[PDB]
Amino acid sequence: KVFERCELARTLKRLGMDGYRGISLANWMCLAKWESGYNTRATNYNAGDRSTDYGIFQINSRYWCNDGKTPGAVNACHLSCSALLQDNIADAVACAKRAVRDPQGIRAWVAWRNRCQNRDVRQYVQGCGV
C-alpha cells in the first residue's frame, strides 16, 4: 500500500509514535518518506552484505526480522520479514519501536542523518491535523 502523507501521519499518531523514545512524529514521517516513499511493500536487496531492507521503514534483515537467507542474522523483533510487507503497519511500527530502543535511536538509519537531521521537518506533518 502506498500511503498518502496525512493519512500516514494520523495512523502513526494513533499507533503512539509521536515522541516515542524522544522522536517526534515529523521525524518518523521524514524517515518513511526517504526510505520507501510511504510504500509498505518496498524491498531493497543489499548485494554488498546479503541483507534485505523491508517495508515502509526499510527495516534490515540482519538484526531485526528473519528471512532465513541472511547470513549470521538475528531477529530482534521476533518477526518474519514478511510481516513487514503487510498493508497494515502495526507490526512494522512495533519493530521500529524496538529498533530505536537501542543506543543509536533513529540514527541507525543513515537516510535519516542525510535527509532529516538538523532540517526543518515540519513540512511532513503540516495540515494533517496531528
PDB file of all heavy atoms in Angstrom, residues 4-16:
ATOM      1  N   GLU A   4      -0.896   8.072   1.702  1.00  0.00           N
ATOM      2  CA  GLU A   4      -0.846   9.488   1.350  1.00  0.00           C
ATOM      3  C   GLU A   4      -0.276  10.098   2.623  1.00  0.00           C
ATOM      4  O   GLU A   4      -0.423   9.512   3.704  1.00  0.00           O
ATOM      5  CB  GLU A   4      -2.229  10.041   1.007  1.00  0.00           C
ATOM      6  CG  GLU A   4      -2.758   9.462  -0.315  1.00  0.00           C
ATOM      7  CD  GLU A   4      -3.822  10.314  -0.980  1.00  0.00           C
ATOM      8  OE1 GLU A   4      -4.987  10.276  -0.518  1.00  0.00           O
ATOM      9  OE2 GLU A   4      -3.496  11.003  -1.976  1.00  0.00           O
ATOM     10  N   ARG A   5       0.412  11.226   2.493  1.00  0.00           N
ATOM     11  CA  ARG A   5       1.075  11.868   3.624  1.00  0.00           C
ATOM     12  C   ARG A   5       0.290  11.989   4.920  1.00  0.00           C
ATOM     13  O   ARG A   5       0.660  11.398   5.931  1.00  0.00           O
ATOM     14  CB  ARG A   5       1.601  13.244   3.225  1.00  0.00           C
ATOM     15  CG  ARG A   5       2.485  13.874   4.302  1.00  0.00           C
ATOM     16  CD  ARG A   5       3.068  15.191   3.836  1.00  0.00           C
ATOM     17  NE  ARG A   5       2.047  16.152   3.415  1.00  0.00           N
ATOM     18  CZ  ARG A   5       1.594  17.159   4.166  1.00  0.00           C
ATOM     19  NH1 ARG A   5       2.050  17.340   5.401  1.00  0.00           N
ATOM     20  NH2 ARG A   5       0.675  17.986   3.680  1.00  0.00           N
ATOM     21  N   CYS A   6      -0.798  12.753   4.892  1.00  0.00           N
ATOM     22  CA  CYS A   6      -1.596  12.952   6.101  1.00  0.00           C
ATOM     23  C   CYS A   6      -2.258  11.701   6.633  1.00  0.00           C
ATOM     24  O   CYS A   6      -2.417  11.546   7.843  1.00  0.00           O
ATOM     25  CB  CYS A   6      -2.571  14.113   5.918  1.00  0.00           C
ATOM     26  SG  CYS A   6      -1.659  15.694   5.738  1.00  0.00           S
ATOM     27  N   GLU A   7      -2.608  10.790   5.733  1.00  0.00           N
ATOM     28  CA  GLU A   7      -3.196   9.521   6.118  1.00  0.00           C
ATOM     29  C   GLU A   7      -2.195   8.795   7.017  1.00  0.00           C
ATOM     30  O   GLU A   7      -2.539   8.310   8.097  1.00  0.00           O
ATOM     31  CB  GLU A   7      -3.494   8.675   4.875  1.00  0.00           C
ATOM     32  CG  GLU A   7      -3.982   7.268   5.215  1.00  0.00           C
ATOM     33  CD  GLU A   7      -4.098   6.306   4.020  1.00  0.00           C
ATOM     34  OE1 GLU A   7      -3.645   6.599   2.873  1.00  0.00           O
ATOM     35  OE2 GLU A   7      -4.639   5.211   4.268  1.00  0.00           O
ATOM     36  N   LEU A   8      -0.937   8.754   6.585  1.00  0.00           N
ATOM     37  CA  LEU A   8       0.102   8.087   7.365  1.00  0.00           C
ATOM     38  C   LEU A   8       0.373   8.801   8.700  1.00  0.00           C
ATOM     39  O   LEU A   8       0.570   8.158   9.728  1.00  0.00           O
ATOM     40  CB  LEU A   8       1.395   7.991   6.543  1.00  0.00           C
ATOM     41  CG  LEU A   8       2.581   7.344   7.265  1.00  0.00           C
ATOM     42  CD1 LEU A   8       2.273   5.893   7.599  1.00  0.00           C
ATOM     43  CD2 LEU A   8       3.817   7.436   6.389  1.00  0.00           C
ATOM     44  N   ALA A   9       0.397  10.131   8.672  1.00  0.00           N
ATOM     45  CA  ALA A   9       0.659  10.927   9.868  1.00  0.00           C
ATOM     46  C   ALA A   9      -0.349  10.582  10.958  1.00  0.00           C
ATOM     47  O   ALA A   9       0.023  10.337  12.116  1.00  0.00           O
ATOM     48  CB  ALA A   9       0.603  12.428   9.535  1.00  0.00           C
ATOM     49  N   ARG A  10      -1.622  10.501  10.566  1.00  0.00           N
ATOM     50  CA  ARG A  10      -2.680  10.175  11.521  1.00  0.00           C
ATOM     51  C   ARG A  10      -2.550   8.764  12.061  1.00  0.00           C
ATOM     52  O   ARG A  10      -2.696   8.560  13.268  1.00  0.00           O
ATOM     53  CB  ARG A  10      -4.059  10.429  10.903  1.00  0.00           C
ATOM     54  CG  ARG A  10      -4.296  11.905  10.663  1.00  0.00           C
ATOM     55  CD  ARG A  10      -5.724  12.195  10.260  1.00  0.00           C
ATOM     56  NE  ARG A  10      -6.053  11.748   8.913  1.00  0.00           N
ATOM     57  CZ  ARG A  10      -5.968  12.523   7.840  1.00  0.00           C
ATOM     58  NH1 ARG A  10      -5.506  13.760   7.943  1.00  0.00           N
ATOM     59  NH2 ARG A  10      -6.311  12.052   6.657  1.00  0.00           N
ATOM     60  N   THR A  11      -2.189   7.817  11.188  1.00  0.00           N
ATOM     61  CA  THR A  11      -2.013   6.420  11.574  1.00  0.00           C
ATOM     62  C   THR A  11      -0.876   6.256  12.582  1.00  0.00           C
ATOM     63  O   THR A  11      -1.017   5.563  13.593  1.00  0.00           O
ATOM     64  CB  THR A  11      -1.757   5.525  10.335  1.00  0.00           C
ATOM     65  OG1 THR A  11      -2.839   5.682   9.415  1.00  0.00           O
ATOM     66  CG2 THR A  11      -1.654   4.062  10.726  1.00  0.00           C
ATOM     67  N   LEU A  12       0.256   6.899  12.312  1.00  0.00           N
ATOM     68  CA  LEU A  12       1.408   6.817  13.210  1.00  0.00           C
ATOM     69  C   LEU A  12       1.084   7.406  14.581  1.00  0.00           C
ATOM     70  O   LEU A  12       1.448   6.840  15.606  1.00  0.00           O
ATOM     71  CB  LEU A  12       2.628   7.503  12.579  1.00  0.00           C
ATOM     72  CG  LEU A  12       3.240   6.862  11.312  1.00  0.00           C
ATOM     73  CD1 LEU A  12       4.505   7.643  10.869  1.00  0.00           C
ATOM     74  CD2 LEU A  12       3.579   5.381  11.551  1.00  0.00           C
ATOM     75  N   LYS A  13       0.368   8.526  14.603  1.00  0.00           N
ATOM     76  CA  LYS A  13      -0.017   9.143  15.871  1.00  0.00           C
ATOM     77  C   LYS A  13      -0.885   8.201  16.722  1.00  0.00           C
ATOM     78  O   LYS A  13      -0.661   8.057  17.926  1.00  0.00           O
ATOM     79  CB  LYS A  13      -0.760  10.459  15.653  1.00  0.00           C
ATOM     80  CG  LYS A  13      -1.002  11.194  16.960  1.00  0.00           C
ATOM     81  CD  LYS A  13      -1.305  12.647  16.740  1.00  0.00           C
ATOM     82  CE  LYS A  13      -1.031  13.448  18.012  1.00  0.00           C
ATOM     83  NZ  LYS A  13      -1.798  12.893  19.163  1.00  0.00           N
ATOM     84  N   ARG A  14      -1.859   7.552  16.087  1.00  0.00           N
ATOM     85  CA  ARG A  14      -2.758   6.626  16.774  1.00  0.00           C
ATOM     86  C   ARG A  14      -1.982   5.407  17.294  1.00  0.00           C
ATOM     87  O   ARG A  14      -2.319   4.832  18.335  1.00  0.00           O
ATOM     88  CB  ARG A  14      -3.873   6.212  15.808  1.00  0.00           C
ATOM     89  CG  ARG A  14      -5.100   5.590  16.434  1.00  0.00           C
ATOM     90  CD  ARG A  14      -6.291   5.658  15.469  1.00  0.00           C
ATOM     91  NE  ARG A  14      -5.933   5.226  14.114  1.00  0.00           N
ATOM     92  CZ  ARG A  14      -6.121   5.948  13.007  1.00  0.00           C
ATOM     93  NH1 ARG A  14      -6.685   7.157  13.062  1.00  0.00           N
ATOM     94  NH2 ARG A  14      -5.747   5.452  11.832  1.00  0.00           N
ATOM     95  N   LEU A  15      -0.913   5.040  16.587  1.00  0.00           N
ATOM     96  CA  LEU A  15      -0.073   3.904  16.976  1.00  0.00           C
ATOM     97  C   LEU A  15       0.938   4.296  18.050  1.00  0.00           C
ATOM     98  O   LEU A  15       1.779   3.489  18.454  1.00  0.00           O
ATOM     99  CB  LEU A  15       0.622   3.302  15.745  1.00  0.00           C
ATOM    100  CG  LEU A  15      -0.329   2.666  14.728  1.00  0.00           C
ATOM    101  CD1 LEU A  15       0.394   2.339  13.449  1.00  0.00           C
ATOM    102  CD2 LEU A  15      -0.921   1.418  15.330  1.00  0.00           C
ATOM    103  N   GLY A  16       0.864   5.552  18.486  1.00  0.00           N
ATOM    104  CA  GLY A  16       1.724   6.044  19.542  1.00  0.00           C
ATOM    105  C   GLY A  16       3.167   6.347  19.194  1.00  0.00           C
ATOM    106  O   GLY A  16       4.041   6.215  20.046  1.00  0.00           O
TER     107      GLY A  16
END
